[PDB]
Amino acid sequence: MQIFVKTLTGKTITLEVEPSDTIENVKAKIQDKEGIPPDQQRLIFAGKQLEDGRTLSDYNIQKESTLHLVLRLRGGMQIFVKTLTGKTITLEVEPSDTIENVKAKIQDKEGIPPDQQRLIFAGKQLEDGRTLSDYNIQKESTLHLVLRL
Ligand SMILES: [Cl-]
Ligand SMILES: [Zn+2]
Ligand SMILES: [Zn+2]
Ligand SMILES: [Zn+2]
């Protein structure tokens, strides 16, 4: 019995499996071939994220089925703030946070009063009271901090 895995490079690997092989077992096989650890794997079949403890047969995964591998990451929503002198601050934020909130977080880390902070995103200077969501600031976006002293 063989199934196919569409890997993270774009390629497709073949795995020799058995109907009762768990998803956990499949993740091990992938880690052997692609060298990515099971904790990092999310396996998608026919629109369904697959569960570690269940078997191929529980999911009716038949010969020649194609599993899609997706990278799995873990961490609170973060953004970066670059300084005049190239230090990068990492911040834990939420989509609803206002720029006011973000300035309070900068004061927390670096001790700069909010009223001395100017924050820029995609060349655009941000206004407090508007949220990160309004500006389309996503996880791992980068803000630039400028100071009115
Ligand atoms: Cl086997
Ligand atoms: Zn066996
Ligand atoms: Zn917040
Ligand atoms: Zn302000």
Ligand SMILES: [Zn+2]
């Ligand atoms: Zn990322």
